[PDB]
């Protein structure tokens, strides 16, 4: 159950930041669950294999490249290649993201989310998983720093012993 | 072709390509010029020809920033005046100049 939380500036409100949590079980191809939040409400949606397949063949592209672009947009793996823009109507619950280049827009994808009655639990789950990853990363880095120090010390020792060996 | 059917054809062949005719034509010119000027150096473009009835469909496929770009030139047999002034008279002029 891989997860990824990203920050997107919705076109409707430029200054305000919206947060986008995408989760997939095995791989992004099989489908994913998306949750868009802003702190006061959450909108949840699903994309199964059939829907992504329909999107891929309807656009008439190779499925692998479509998945690559979808990951570069949703998962926030974009480089300097080119920019994306997202749109989301609150009274229609119709999210859609496109790739903008040279004033030319490509409607890369469109999902239909739906309002969830209880936003407090989703927000709390987001932050709790976030702090869990925080703590796990701290633990891993602290553990590996000790291995770093051990490696440096052992290298110093063995270098000294090689110096003695060559001198003798 | 002028700037009234360009948008129609662009939207028909690309259901999610919301661009003005100017940008589409600029992209087409950029795609076509390197091939015409120099023989297939870029090699990014793909061309196909279909002859149905008296018309000709020239399909051009390209990768606009890695995304599909389809175009279809619909050509009808040129009038006698156009073919004349484009091929016949110029060639006679060239022959006369070479003889001189």
CSV table of C-alpha atoms in Angstrom, one decimal:
chain,number,residue,atom,x,y,z
A,1,UNK,CA,0.0,0.0,0.0
A,2,UNK,CA,2.2,2.8,-1.3
A,3,UNK,CA,1.2,6.4,-0.6
A,4,UNK,CA,2.2,9.8,-1.8
A,5,UNK,CA,1.1,13.3,-0.6
A,6,UNK,CA,1.8,16.3,-2.8
A,7,UNK,CA,1.0,20.0,-2.9
A,8,UNK,CA,-1.0,21.5,-5.8
A,9,UNK,CA,-2.2,25.1,-6.3
A,10,UNK,CA,-5.7,24.8,-7.8
A,11,UNK,CA,-6.4,27.2,-10.6
A,12,UNK,CA,-9.6,28.4,-8.9
A,13,UNK,CA,-7.7,29.7,-5.9
A,14,UNK,CA,-4.0,30.5,-6.7
A,15,UNK,CA,-2.7,31.4,-3.2
A,16,UNK,CA,-4.5,28.6,-1.4
A,17,UNK,CA,-2.7,25.2,-1.4
A,18,UNK,CA,-4.6,22.0,-1.8
A,19,UNK,CA,-3.1,18.7,-0.7
A,20,UNK,CA,-3.4,15.5,-2.8
A,21,UNK,CA,-2.9,12.0,-1.4
A,22,UNK,CA,-2.7,9.2,-3.9
A,23,UNK,CA,-2.4,5.6,-2.8
A,24,UNK,CA,-2.0,2.4,-4.8
A,25,UNK,CA,-1.7,-1.2,-3.6
A,26,UNK,CA,0.7,-2.9,-6.0
A,27,UNK,CA,1.3,-0.5,-8.9
A,28,UNK,CA,-0.2,2.6,-10.3
A,29,UNK,CA,-1.4,0.7,-13.4
A,30,UNK,CA,-4.0,-1.4,-11.5
A,31,UNK,CA,-5.7,1.7,-10.1
A,32,UNK,CA,-5.4,4.2,-7.2
A,33,UNK,CA,-7.4,6.0,-4.5
A,34,UNK,CA,-7.1,9.8,-4.5
A,35,UNK,CA,-8.1,12.2,-1.7
A,36,UNK,CA,-8.0,16.0,-2.1
A,37,UNK,CA,-8.1,18.1,1.0
A,38,UNK,CA,-7.7,21.7,2.1
A,39,UNK,CA,-8.0,21.4,5.9
A,40,UNK,CA,-11.8,21.8,6.2
A,41,UNK,CA,-13.2,19.2,3.8
A,42,UNK,CA,-12.0,16.1,1.8
A,43,UNK,CA,-13.0,14.6,-1.5
A,44,UNK,CA,-12.3,10.9,-2.2
A,45,UNK,CA,-12.3,9.1,-5.5
A,46,UNK,CA,-11.2,5.8,-7.1
A,47,UNK,CA,-9.6,4.8,-10.4
A,48,UNK,CA,-9.8,1.1,-11.3
A,49,UNK,CA,-7.9,-0.7,-14.0
A,50,UNK,CA,-10.8,-0.5,-16.5
A,51,UNK,CA,-11.0,3.3,-16.2
A,52,UNK,CA,-7.3,3.9,-16.7
A,53,UNK,CA,-7.4,1.5,-19.7
A,54,UNK,CA,-10.3,3.4,-21.2
A,55,UNK,CA,-8.4,6.6,-20.7
A,56,UNK,CA,-5.3,5.1,-22.4
A,57,UNK,CA,-6.9,3.7,-25.5
A,58,UNK,CA,-9.3,6.6,-25.9
A,59,UNK,CA,-6.4,9.0,-26.0
A,60,UNK,CA,-4.8,6.5,-28.5
A,61,UNK,CA,-1.4,6.4,-26.8
A,62,UNK,CA,0.8,3.7,-25.5
A,63,UNK,CA,-0.3,2.7,-22.0
A,64,UNK,CA,3.2,2.9,-20.5
A,65,UNK,CA,3.7,6.5,-21.6
A,66,UNK,CA,0.3,7.5,-20.3
A,67,UNK,CA,1.1,5.9,-16.9
A,68,UNK,CA,4.5,7.8,-17.0
A,69,UNK,CA,2.8,11.1,-17.6
A,70,UNK,CA,0.1,10.4,-15.0
A,71,UNK,CA,2.8,9.6,-12.4
A,72,UNK,CA,4.8,12.7,-13.4
A,73,UNK,CA,1.7,14.8,-12.8
A,74,UNK,CA,-0.1,13.2,-9.8
A,75,UNK,CA,2.9,11.9,-7.9
A,76,UNK,CA,4.8,15.2,-8.4
A,77,UNK,CA,7.9,13.7,-10.1
A,78,UNK,CA,7.9,16.6,-12.6
A,79,UNK,CA,11.3,18.0,-13.7
A,80,UNK,CA,12.0,21.0,-16.0
A,81,UNK,CA,10.2,19.3,-18.9
A,82,UNK,CA,7.0,21.2,-18.7
A,83,UNK,CA,4.2,22.3,-16.4
A,84,UNK,CA,0.7,20.9,-15.4
A,85,UNK,CA,-2.5,22.6,-14.2
A,86,UNK,CA,-5.3,21.1,-12.2
A,87,UNK,CA,-9.0,22.2,-12.1
A,88,UNK,CA,-11.7,21.2,-9.6
A,89,UNK,CA,-15.2,22.5,-9.2
A,90,UNK,CA,-16.6,22.2,-5.7
A,91,UNK,CA,-20.3,22.1,-6.6
A,92,UNK,CA,-19.7,19.6,-9.4
A,93,UNK,CA,-17.0,17.3,-7.8
A,94,UNK,CA,-15.2,16.9,-11.1
A,95,UNK,CA,-11.4,17.0,-10.9
A,96,UNK,CA,-9.3,17.1,-14.1
A,97,UNK,CA,-5.6,17.8,-14.7
A,98,UNK,CA,-3.9,18.8,-18.0
A,99,UNK,CA,-0.4,19.5,-19.3
A,100,UNK,CA,0.2,23.1,-20.5
A,101,UNK,CA,2.9,23.9,-23.0
A,102,UNK,CA,3.1,26.8,-25.5
A,103,UNK,CA,-0.5,27.8,-24.7
A,104,UNK,CA,-1.5,24.3,-25.8
A,105,UNK,CA,-3.4,22.3,-23.3
A,106,UNK,CA,-3.8,18.5,-23.2
A,107,UNK,CA,-6.6,17.1,-21.0
A,108,UNK,CA,-4.4,14.4,-19.5
A,109,UNK,CA,-7.0,13.0,-17.1
A,110,UNK,CA,-10.3,13.6,-15.3
A,111,UNK,CA,-11.7,11.9,-12.2
A,112,UNK,CA,-15.0,12.2,-10.4
A,113,UNK,CA,-14.4,12.6,-6.6
A,114,UNK,CA,-17.2,12.8,-4.0
A,115,UNK,CA,-17.6,14.6,-0.7
A,116,UNK,CA,-16.8,12.6,2.4
A,117,UNK,CA,-19.0,13.4,5.4
A,118,UNK,CA,-16.2,13.3,8.0
A,119,UNK,CA,-13.1,15.3,7.2
A,120,UNK,CA,-11.5,15.2,10.7
A,121,UNK,CA,-10.7,11.5,10.5
A,122,UNK,CA,-9.0,11.7,7.0
A,123,UNK,CA,-7.0,14.8,8.1
A,124,UNK,CA,-5.9,13.0,11.3
A,125,UNK,CA,-5.0,9.9,9.4
A,126,UNK,CA,-2.9,11.9,6.9
A,127,UNK,CA,-1.0,13.7,9.7
A,128,UNK,CA,-0.5,10.5,11.7
A,129,UNK,CA,1.0,8.6,8.8
A,130,UNK,CA,3.1,11.7,8.1
A,131,UNK,CA,4.5,11.7,11.6
A,132,UNK,CA,5.0,7.9,11.4
A,133,UNK,CA,7.2,8.4,8.3
A,134,UNK,CA,9.0,11.3,10.0
A,135,UNK,CA,9.9,9.1,13.0
A,136,UNK,CA,10.9,6.1,10.8
A,137,UNK,CA,13.2,8.3,8.8
A,138,UNK,CA,14.8,9.8,12.0
A,139,UNK,CA,15.4,6.3,13.3
A,140,UNK,CA,16.9,5.0,10.1
A,141,UNK,CA,19.3,8.1,9.7
A,142,UNK,CA,20.4,7.9,13.4
A,143,UNK,CA,21.0,4.1,13.0
A,144,UNK,CA,23.1,4.6,9.9
A,145,UNK,CA,25.2,7.4,11.3
A,146,UNK,CA,26.6,4.9,13.8
A,147,UNK,CA,27.5,2.6,11.0
A,148,UNK,CA,29.2,5.6,9.3
A,149,UNK,CA,31.3,6.3,12.5
A,150,UNK,CA,32.2,2.6,12.8
A,151,UNK,CA,33.3,2.4,9.2
A,152,UNK,CA,35.5,5.5,9.6
A,153,UNK,CA,37.1,4.2,12.8
A,154,UNK,CA,37.7,0.8,11.4
A,155,UNK,CA,39.3,2.3,8.2
A,156,UNK,CA,41.6,4.4,10.3
A,157,UNK,CA,42.7,1.3,12.3
A,158,UNK,CA,43.3,-0.8,9.2
A,159,UNK,CA,45.2,2.0,7.5
A,160,UNK,CA,47.5,2.3,10.5
A,161,UNK,CA,48.0,-1.5,10.5
A,162,UNK,CA,48.9,-1.4,6.8
A,163,UNK,CA,51.3,1.4,7.5
A,164,UNK,CA,53.0,-0.8,10.1
A,165,UNK,CA,53.0,-3.8,7.8
A,166,UNK,CA,54.7,-1.9,4.9
A,167,UNK,CA,57.2,-0.3,7.3
A,168,UNK,CA,58.2,-3.7,8.7
B,1,UNK,CA,-6.7,26.1,-45.6
B,2,UNK,CA,-7.6,29.3,-43.6
B,3,UNK,CA,-8.3,29.8,-39.9
B,4,UNK,CA,-11.8,28.5,-39.7
B,5,UNK,CA,-11.5,24.8,-40.5
B,6,UNK,CA,-8.1,24.5,-38.8
B,7,UNK,CA,-9.7,24.5,-35.4
B,8,UNK,CA,-12.4,22.0,-36.5
B,9,UNK,CA,-9.9,19.5,-37.9
B,10,UNK,CA,-7.6,19.9,-34.9
B,11,UNK,CA,-10.4,19.2,-32.5
B,12,UNK,CA,-11.7,16.3,-34.6
B,13,UNK,CA,-8.3,14.6,-34.8
B,14,UNK,CA,-7.3,15.5,-31.2
B,15,UNK,CA,-10.3,15.5,-28.9
B,16,UNK,CA,-8.2,17.0,-26.0
B,17,UNK,CA,-6.0,19.5,-27.9
B,18,UNK,CA,-7.4,23.0,-26.8
B,19,UNK,CA,-5.1,25.3,-28.8
B,20,UNK,CA,-5.6,28.4,-31.0
B,21,UNK,CA,-5.1,27.9,-34.8
B,22,UNK,CA,-2.0,30.1,-34.6
B,23,UNK,CA,-0.1,27.8,-32.2
B,24,UNK,CA,-1.2,24.7,-34.1
B,25,UNK,CA,0.1,26.2,-37.4
B,26,UNK,CA,3.3,27.3,-35.8
B,27,UNK,CA,3.9,23.8,-34.4
B,28,UNK,CA,3.1,22.3,-37.8
B,29,UNK,CA,5.5,24.6,-39.6
B,30,UNK,CA,8.3,23.8,-37.0
B,31,UNK,CA,7.6,20.1,-37.5
B,32,UNK,CA,7.6,20.3,-41.3
B,33,UNK,CA,10.4,22.8,-42.1
B,34,UNK,CA,13.4,20.6,-41.0
B,35,UNK,CA,12.2,17.7,-43.1
B,36,UNK,CA,11.7,19.7,-46.2
B,37,UNK,CA,14.9,21.7,-45.9
B,38,UNK,CA,17.0,18.6,-45.2
B,39,UNK,CA,16.1,15.0,-45.9
B,40,UNK,CA,15.0,13.2,-42.8
B,41,UNK,CA,17.7,14.3,-40.4
B,42,UNK,CA,15.4,14.7,-37.3
B,43,UNK,CA,13.4,11.6,-38.3
B,44,UNK,CA,10.8,12.4,-35.6
B,45,UNK,CA,7.9,12.9,-38.0
B,46,UNK,CA,6.0,10.1,-39.6
B,47,UNK,CA,4.1,10.5,-43.0
B,48,UNK,CA,1.5,8.3,-44.6
B,49,UNK,CA,-0.4,8.7,-47.9
B,50,UNK,CA,-3.8,7.5,-48.9
B,51,UNK,CA,-5.4,7.8,-52.4
B,52,UNK,CA,-9.2,7.5,-52.3
B,53,UNK,CA,-11.3,8.7,-55.3
B,54,UNK,CA,-9.7,11.9,-56.7
B,55,UNK,CA,-8.7,13.1,-53.2
B,56,UNK,CA,-5.4,12.5,-51.2
B,57,UNK,CA,-5.1,12.1,-47.5
B,58,UNK,CA,-1.7,12.9,-46.1
B,59,UNK,CA,-1.4,11.9,-42.5
B,60,UNK,CA,1.4,13.4,-40.3
B,61,UNK,CA,2.2,12.1,-36.9
B,62,UNK,CA,4.6,13.8,-34.5
B,63,UNK,CA,5.6,14.0,-30.8
B,64,UNK,CA,4.8,17.4,-29.5
B,65,UNK,CA,6.8,17.3,-26.2
B,66,UNK,CA,6.3,13.5,-26.2
B,67,UNK,CA,2.5,13.8,-26.7
B,68,UNK,CA,0.6,12.8,-29.9
B,69,UNK,CA,0.2,15.3,-32.7
B,70,UNK,CA,-2.0,14.2,-35.6
B,71,UNK,CA,-2.7,16.1,-38.8
B,72,UNK,CA,-4.4,15.2,-42.1
B,73,UNK,CA,-4.0,17.2,-45.3
B,74,UNK,CA,-7.0,16.8,-47.6
B,75,UNK,CA,-5.8,17.5,-51.1
B,76,UNK,CA,-7.9,17.8,-54.3
B,77,UNK,CA,-6.6,17.7,-57.9
B,78,UNK,CA,-5.2,21.2,-58.6
B,79,UNK,CA,-6.7,23.3,-61.3
B,80,UNK,CA,-5.0,23.6,-64.7
B,81,UNK,CA,-3.9,27.2,-64.0
B,82,UNK,CA,-2.1,26.3,-60.7
B,83,UNK,CA,-0.2,23.3,-62.2
B,84,UNK,CA,0.6,25.3,-65.3
B,85,UNK,CA,2.0,28.4,-63.5
B,86,UNK,CA,3.8,26.2,-60.9
B,87,UNK,CA,5.5,23.6,-63.2
B,88,UNK,CA,5.2,24.2,-66.9
B,89,UNK,CA,6.2,27.9,-67.5
B,90,UNK,CA,9.0,27.9,-64.9
B,91,UNK,CA,10.6,24.8,-66.4
B,92,UNK,CA,10.5,26.4,-69.9
B,93,UNK,CA,12.2,29.4,-68.4
B,94,UNK,CA,14.9,27.2,-66.8
B,95,UNK,CA,15.5,25.4,-70.1
B,96,UNK,CA,15.9,28.6,-72.0
B,97,UNK,CA,18.3,30.0,-69.4
B,98,UNK,CA,20.4,26.8,-69.6
B,99,UNK,CA,20.5,27.0,-73.4
B,100,UNK,CA,21.6,30.6,-73.1
